[PDB]
Structures are given as structure tokens and as C-alpha cells.
Design an enzyme around this catalytic site. Structure first.
Site, PDB file in Angstrom:
ATOM      1  N   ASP A  32       0.827  -1.204   0.000  1.00  0.00           N
ATOM      2  CA  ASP A  32       0.000   0.000   0.000  1.00  0.00           C
ATOM      3  C   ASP A  32       0.868   1.264   0.000  1.00  0.00           C
ATOM      4  O   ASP A  32       1.373   1.687   1.048  1.00  0.00           O
ATOM      5  CB  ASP A  32      -0.920   0.000   1.232  1.00  0.00           C
ATOM      6  N   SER A  35      -0.110   4.296   2.641  1.00  0.00           N
ATOM      7  CA  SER A  35       0.074   4.306   4.084  1.00  0.00           C
ATOM      8  C   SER A  35       1.485   3.843   4.390  1.00  0.00           C
ATOM      9  O   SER A  35       2.233   3.467   3.482  1.00  0.00           O
ATOM     10  CB  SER A  35      -0.976   3.404   4.757  1.00  0.00           C
ATOM     11  N   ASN A  37       2.366   1.947   7.712  1.00  0.00           N
ATOM     12  CA  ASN A  37       2.495   0.950   8.764  1.00  0.00           C
ATOM     13  C   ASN A  37       2.404  -0.445   8.171  1.00  0.00           C
ATOM     14  O   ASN A  37       1.702  -0.678   7.182  1.00  0.00           O
ATOM     15  CB  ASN A  37       1.377   1.109   9.803  1.00  0.00           C
ATOM     16  N   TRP A  39       1.127  -4.086   9.581  1.00  0.00           N
ATOM     17  CA  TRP A  39       0.450  -4.751  10.696  1.00  0.00           C
ATOM     18  C   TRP A  39      -0.237  -6.005  10.176  1.00  0.00           C
ATOM     19  O   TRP A  39      -0.560  -6.110   8.991  1.00  0.00           O
ATOM     20  CB  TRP A  39      -0.579  -3.837  11.395  1.00  0.00           C
ATOM     21  N   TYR A  75      -8.236   3.742   8.251  1.00  0.00           N
ATOM     22  CA  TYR A  75      -8.164   3.812   6.805  1.00  0.00           C
ATOM     23  C   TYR A  75      -9.475   4.371   6.255  1.00  0.00           C
ATOM     24  O   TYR A  75     -10.481   4.476   6.965  1.00  0.00           O
ATOM     25  CB  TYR A  75      -7.876   2.420   6.208  1.00  0.00           C
ATOM     26  N   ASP A 215      -1.543   5.610  -5.212  1.00  0.00           N
ATOM     27  CA  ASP A 215      -1.909   4.724  -4.107  1.00  0.00           C
ATOM     28  C   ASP A 215      -2.303   3.331  -4.610  1.00  0.00           C
ATOM     29  O   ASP A 215      -3.423   3.115  -5.112  1.00  0.00           O
ATOM     30  CB  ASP A 215      -3.038   5.364  -3.313  1.00  0.00           C
ATOM     31  N   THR A 218      -5.651   1.504  -3.204  1.00  0.00           N
ATOM     32  CA  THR A 218      -6.972   2.005  -3.523  1.00  0.00           C
ATOM     33  C   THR A 218      -7.370   1.489  -4.891  1.00  0.00           C
ATOM     34  O   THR A 218      -6.608   1.606  -5.847  1.00  0.00           O
ATOM     35  CB  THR A 218      -7.013   3.553  -3.525  1.00  0.00           C
TER      36      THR A 218
HETATM   37  C1  LIG Z   1     -15.352  -4.497  -3.237  1.00  0.00           C
HETATM   38  C2  LIG Z   1     -14.589  -3.967  -4.388  1.00  0.00           C
HETATM   39  C3  LIG Z   1     -15.372  -3.348  -5.518  1.00  0.00           C
HETATM   40  C4  LIG Z   1     -13.654  -2.980  -3.855  1.00  0.00           C
HETATM   41  N1  LIG Z   1     -12.798  -3.061  -2.830  1.00  0.00           N
HETATM   42  C5  LIG Z   1     -12.098  -1.931  -2.685  1.00  0.00           C
HETATM   43  C6  LIG Z   1     -11.069  -1.704  -1.620  1.00  0.00           C
HETATM   44  N2  LIG Z   1     -11.425  -0.407  -1.050  1.00  0.00           N
HETATM   45  C7  LIG Z   1     -12.674  -0.398  -0.323  1.00  0.00           C
HETATM   46  C8  LIG Z   1     -10.627   0.630  -1.205  1.00  0.00           C
HETATM   47  O1  LIG Z   1      -9.770   0.609  -2.060  1.00  0.00           O
HETATM   48  N3  LIG Z   1     -10.744   1.657  -0.394  1.00  0.00           N
HETATM   49  C9  LIG Z   1      -9.648   2.603  -0.164  1.00  0.00           C
HETATM   50  C10 LIG Z   1      -8.766   2.342   1.009  1.00  0.00           C
HETATM   51  O2  LIG Z   1      -9.151   2.607   2.133  1.00  0.00           O
HETATM   52  N4  LIG Z   1      -7.563   1.807   0.820  1.00  0.00           N
HETATM   53  C11 LIG Z   1      -6.775   1.484   1.989  1.00  0.00           C
HETATM   54  C12 LIG Z   1      -6.492  -0.012   2.048  1.00  0.00           C
HETATM   55  C13 LIG Z   1      -7.578  -0.690   2.819  1.00  0.00           C
HETATM   56  C14 LIG Z   1      -8.566  -1.380   2.142  1.00  0.00           C
HETATM   57  C15 LIG Z   1      -9.569  -2.017   2.863  1.00  0.00           C
HETATM   58  C16 LIG Z   1      -9.578  -1.960   4.251  1.00  0.00           C
HETATM   59  C17 LIG Z   1      -8.578  -1.266   4.923  1.00  0.00           C
HETATM   60  C18 LIG Z   1      -7.572  -0.630   4.203  1.00  0.00           C
HETATM   61  C19 LIG Z   1      -5.402   2.145   1.968  1.00  0.00           C
HETATM   62  C20 LIG Z   1      -5.344   3.414   1.130  1.00  0.00           C
HETATM   63  O3  LIG Z   1      -3.973   3.543   0.693  1.00  0.00           O
HETATM   64  C21 LIG Z   1      -5.760   4.648   1.901  1.00  0.00           C
HETATM   65  C22 LIG Z   1      -5.864   5.854   0.965  1.00  0.00           C
HETATM   66  C23 LIG Z   1      -6.189   7.040   1.823  1.00  0.00           C
HETATM   67  C24 LIG Z   1      -5.196   7.917   2.193  1.00  0.00           C
HETATM   68  C25 LIG Z   1      -5.515   9.000   3.005  1.00  0.00           C
HETATM   69  C26 LIG Z   1      -6.820   9.184   3.448  1.00  0.00           C
HETATM   70  C27 LIG Z   1      -7.805   8.285   3.073  1.00  0.00           C
HETATM   71  C28 LIG Z   1      -7.484   7.205   2.269  1.00  0.00           C
HETATM   72  N5  LIG Z   1      -4.800   4.965   2.936  1.00  0.00           N
HETATM   73  C29 LIG Z   1      -5.158   5.252   4.177  1.00  0.00           C
HETATM   74  O4  LIG Z   1      -6.316   5.297   4.559  1.00  0.00           O
HETATM   75  O5  LIG Z   1      -4.094   5.534   5.108  1.00  0.00           O
HETATM   76  C30 LIG Z   1      -4.400   5.441   6.450  1.00  0.00           C
HETATM   77  C31 LIG Z   1      -4.009   6.704   7.141  1.00  0.00           C
HETATM   78  C32 LIG Z   1      -4.643   7.581   8.005  1.00  0.00           C
HETATM   79  N6  LIG Z   1      -3.819   8.600   8.354  1.00  0.00           N
HETATM   80  C33 LIG Z   1      -2.580   8.543   7.799  1.00  0.00           C
HETATM   81  S1  LIG Z   1      -2.395   7.152   6.766  1.00  0.00           S
HETATM   82  C34 LIG Z   1     -10.403   3.908   0.108  1.00  0.00           C
HETATM   83  C35 LIG Z   1      -9.516   5.133   0.018  1.00  0.00           C
HETATM   84  C36 LIG Z   1     -11.583   4.053  -0.848  1.00  0.00           C
HETATM   85  C37 LIG Z   1     -12.437  -0.944  -3.592  1.00  0.00           C
HETATM   86  S2  LIG Z   1     -13.661  -1.474  -4.692  1.00  0.00           S
END
Ligand SMILES: CC(C)c1nc(CN(C)C(=O)N[C@H](C(=O)N[C@@H](Cc2ccccc2)C[C@H](O)[C@H](Cc2ccccc2)NC(=O)OCc2cncs2)C(C)C)cs1
Length: 325
Positions: A32, A35, A37, A39, A75, A215, A218
Site C-alpha cells: 500500500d 500508508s 504501517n 500490521w 483507513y 496509491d 486504492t
Molecule cells: C469491493 C470492491 C469493488 C472494492 N474493494 C475496494 C477496496 N477499497 C474499499 C478501497 O480501495 N478503499 C480505499 C482504502 O481505504 N484503501 C486502503 C487499504 C484498505 C482497504 C480495505 C480496508 C482497509 C484498508 C489504503 C489506502 O492507501 C488509503 C488511501 C487514503 C489515504 C488518506 C486518506 C484516506 C485514504 N490509505 C489510508 O487510509 O491511510 C491510512 C491513514 C490515516 N492517516 C494517515 S495514513 C479507500 C480510500 C476508498 C475498492 S472497490
């Protein structure tokens, strides 16, 4: 030079396996760039997402060293809390010794329950790492386990094999043309300045510039919800009965490329890239408001990265882009 294969899960998630401890306990983690970290779930966690994924067991590792530092991450989708600890991490054929990482103790929410991967390996800058945990690539550089302070990412299309994170290397087998280098605007994310988003010659978003991050974690190309809304209409998308941006599959042949201008260089995305196809055709764009100091962030996620081999260079704080082979 370390080669970490990635599994392409439905063009939406790219994760590779790592080992933690001695002997190695295996985990799939998202690689990723949004971000910083590392974990994984642990035996200390009772959440449902922990129960249907692999859980790290410190008692079975001879090289584990506990810390009393706690960790919390939110996230864009889900969240976790846990404990930091130290162990040897196997990644890309490299023995990353004395790596600090998070051992989850809570993982609430639906999404991580249904995700195929166990955890997250962040590849961004230390400045946005929760509780200042040394990111994995920083620990590799500091121990001299890669010779060049950079890594590159190839993400496959159409659910093919071959996606790869290359630690310490650039492989020109994976792109054509020359790499274009983009300065990092703000060191935290891999954040760059996007100059314009155009379609058929006309600017349709990001007029006068906007901040964006590259990213890998994402799936979609996201931006401010307002700006995204105009793009959704300019390509002919609209919410369905059940809340998804349907585009006719008829339009993949009709519409022109959407062009991202970055550091003055044009990077087109064709309809076959920004329209997700399966009978069923959805928008590759999605609204999501990411407020920061520098401004509201656009996210160049896997939709964009699939079309451009990407080099992340910490030596000179630049991002390299070239069309994929
Ligand atoms: C079901 C199928 C159609 C899909 N699955 C997906 C997977 N999904 C939900 C995403 O890509 N969603 C993205 C996401 O969170 N990506 C995450 C990986 C993840 C996925 C699932 C569960 C936990 C973590 C990781 C991404 O690099 C995001 C991008 C981002 C950056 C800054 C602020 C907000 C967002 N990074 C973070 O959230 O960083 C965490 C931080 C907070 N403070 C500092 S870093 C969102 C930004 C939309 C998309 S479509």
C-alpha cells in the site's frame, strides 16, 4: 534486488505474501503506497475479521521482541488497533530483521471480514506512520538490504498473474518509452501535483491544479465528490437501484480518453481503463473527500497504476511513470 509477486484479486486488490517470525508465519498483505504501517492480525484480537484471517502468534517465534507501544490506524474503509512488536519479516526474498510491526487487537467493521488479505504493508513516508513505527522500506534501506533507495510497482490487468513490487530496482521489461519523473509535492503520501484533467480537449476537473497521491492500496480513481460528480455525468454514469455508477458497456467504444496532466506531461486513460467491465460496466471513478494541509486529495489508485508502471524513489523524492508494456 527483491521481487515480491502480487496476486491480482479481481483488479481491485493486490496483495502478496510475507513471512513473520522464526519459523516464518505467513500472511497476505496489501502493498500500500498510501500508508506507512505494517500490521497483521494477532492471537490477541477477538474481532471477527481476526477470526477469519491468519493470526500472528508471538509465542511461536524465537526472534519476537515485545514492545509496550500501542497503535491505532483508521483507513478510508476500516480501522485497527493493536500493539507494536519486533521480528524478522521475509518480503520479496529479503530477510528484513528487527522490523517493527503492528499486532492487531481490534479490527472492527465489515470490510476487513470479507477482504481476502490479512493485513497491510505500507510503502509511504515515515511522517504519516502511526506511532512513528519505522516503515518496512525505511528499515530495508537503513540496514542496507537494498542498494538503491527506491522500489517499483507493476500491477497487471484483467486479473492476470505478473503483478510485482520490485524492491531496489527498476525493470524496463515492464514499460515502454522513457520514465517521466514527477517531484513529490509533500512528503507523507506519495503526493504529487496534478495540473489538469481533460476530455476531448476540454478541462473537466482540477482546473488550476490539485494535489494527488499515487496509491496502490486504492482500487479506484477517486477525487472530491463534487468534481467526481461532473466526471460521472461527462462519461454517462448514474446511480442504479442499488447504488452503483452504471455506464453502458456500449460507451467503452464511443468515448475518448480522459487525460491527466502531471508535471506538464500527458497521461491518458482510455475507456477500457476507466470503465470496469465484467455484461456489467461500472465507473472507475468514485467520490471520496480526503482533507489535508496542502488541500483536498485526489487518489490515483489501481485504475491509473494499471496503465503506468510506477517508480517510487526515496533517494530523490520523485515518482517515475511510464506506460505499461
Ligand atoms: C469491493 C470492491 C469493488 C472494492 N474493494 C475496494 C477496496 N477499497 C474499499 C478501497 O480501495 N478503499 C480505499 C482504502 O481505504 N484503501 C486502503 C487499504 C484498505 C482497504 C480495505 C480496508 C482497509 C484498508 C489504503 C489506502 O492507501 C488509503 C488511501 C487514503 C489515504 C488518506 C486518506 C484516506 C485514504 N490509505 C489510508 O487510509 O491511510 C491510512 C491513514 C490515516 N492517516 C494517515 S495514513 C479507500 C480510500 C476508498 C475498492 S472497490
Amino acid at each position: 534486488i527483491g521481487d515480491e509477486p502480487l496476486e491480482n484479486y479481481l483488479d481491485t486488490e493486490y496483495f502478496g505474501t510475507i513471512g513473520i517470525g522464526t519459523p516464518a508465519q505467513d500472511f497476505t498483505v496489501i502493498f500500500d503506497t498510501g500508508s506507512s504501517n505494517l500490521w497483521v492480525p494477532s492471537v490477541y484480537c477477538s474481532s471477527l475479521a481476526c477470526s477469519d484471517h491468519n493470526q500472528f502468534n508471538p509465542d511461536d517465534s524465537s526472534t519476537f521482541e515485545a514492545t509496550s507501544q500501542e497503535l491505532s490506524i483508521t483507513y478510508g474503509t476500516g480501522s485497527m488497533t493493536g500493539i507494536l512488536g519486533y521480528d524478522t519479516v521475509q518480503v520479496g526474498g529479503i530477510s528484513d530483521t528487527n522490523q517493527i510491526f503492528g499486532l492487531s487487537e481490534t479490527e472492527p467493521g465489515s470490510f476487513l471480514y470479507y477482504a481476502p488479505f490479512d493485513g497491510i504493508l505500507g510503502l509511504a513516508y515515515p511522517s504519516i506512520s502511526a506511532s512513528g513505527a519505522t516503515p518496512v522500506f525505511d528499515n530495508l534501506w537503513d540496514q542496507g538490504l537494498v542498494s538503491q533507495d527506491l522500489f517499483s510497482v507493476y500491477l497487471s490487468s484483467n486479473d492476470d498473474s505478473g503483478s510485482v513490487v520490485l524492491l531496489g530496482g527498476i525493470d524496463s521489461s515492464y514499460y515502454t518509452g522513457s520514465l517521466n519523473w514527477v517531484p513529490v509535492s509533500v512528503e507523507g503520501y506519495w503526493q504529487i501535483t496534478l495540473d489538469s484533467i481533460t476530455m476531448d480537449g476540454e478541462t473537466i476537473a482540477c482546473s488550476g491544479g490539485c494535489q494527488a497521491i499515487v496509491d496502490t492500496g486504492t482500487s479506484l480513481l477517486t477525487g472530491p465528490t463534487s468534481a467526481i460528480a461532473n466526471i460521472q455525468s461527462d462519461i454517462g454514469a448514474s446511480e442504479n437501484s442499488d447504488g452503483e455508477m452504471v455506464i453502458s458497456c456500449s460507451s467503452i467504444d464511443s468515448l475518448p480518453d480522459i487525460v491527466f496532466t502531471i508535471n506538464g506531461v500527458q497521461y491518458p486513460l482510455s475507456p477500457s481503463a476507466y470503465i470496469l467491465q465484467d455484461d456489467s460496466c461500472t465507473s472507475g471513478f468514485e467520490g471520496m473527500d480526503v482533507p489535508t494541509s496542502s488541500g483536498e486529495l485526489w487518489i490515483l489508485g489501481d485504475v491509473f497504476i494499471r496503465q503506468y508502471y510506477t517508480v517510487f524513489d526515496r533517494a530523490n523524492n520523485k515518482v517515475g511513470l511510464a506506460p505499461v508494456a
